[PDB]
Curated annotation (Swiss-Prot):
Miscellaneous remark of the record: Present with 5830 molecules/cell in log phase SD medium.
Domain of life: Eukaryota
Annotated RRM domain residues: 3-74
Organism: Saccharomyces cerevisiae (strain ATCC 204508 / S288c) (Baker's yeast)
Protein task: May be required for packaging pre-mRNAs into ribonucleoprotein structures amenable to efficient nuclear RNA processing. Binds to poly(A)+ RNA. Appears to act in the maintenance of CLN3 mRNA levels.
Gene symbol of the encoding locus: NAB3
Residues of the full protein shown: 329 to 402 of 802
Localization (cell): Nucleus, Nucleoplasm
Protein name as annotated: Nuclear polyadenylated RNA-binding protein 3
Lineage: Eukaryota, Fungi, Dikarya, Ascomycota, Saccharomycotina
Length: 75
RNA sequence: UCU
């Protein structure tokens, strides 16, 4: 557990899994990407990748905004 | 701000 990243505020249009892959692939090997409207879920193969993504990408602009990035709690 |  703890190997999934939650994104809380994606734009509601014009967002692809590939966009998310380009942003988050530097942090580790991504196994799965799910988008449910404003919510993104990126499954890595380990929990450190999620922590690294939150620490580095929270400081960045993506899709013209500051993304809400968290350890995913979703079952 | 959790399919």
């Amino acid at each position: 557990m703890k190997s999934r990243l939650f994104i809380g505020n994606l734009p509601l249009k014009n967002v692809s899994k590939e966009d998310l892959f380009r942003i988050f692939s530097p942090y580790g090997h991504i196994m799965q990407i799910n988008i449910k409207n404003a919510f993104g879920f990126i499954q890595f193969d380990n929990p450190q990748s999620v922590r690294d993504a939150i620490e580095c990408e929270s400081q960045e602009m993506n899709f013209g905004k500051k993304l809400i990035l968290e350890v995913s709690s979703s079952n």
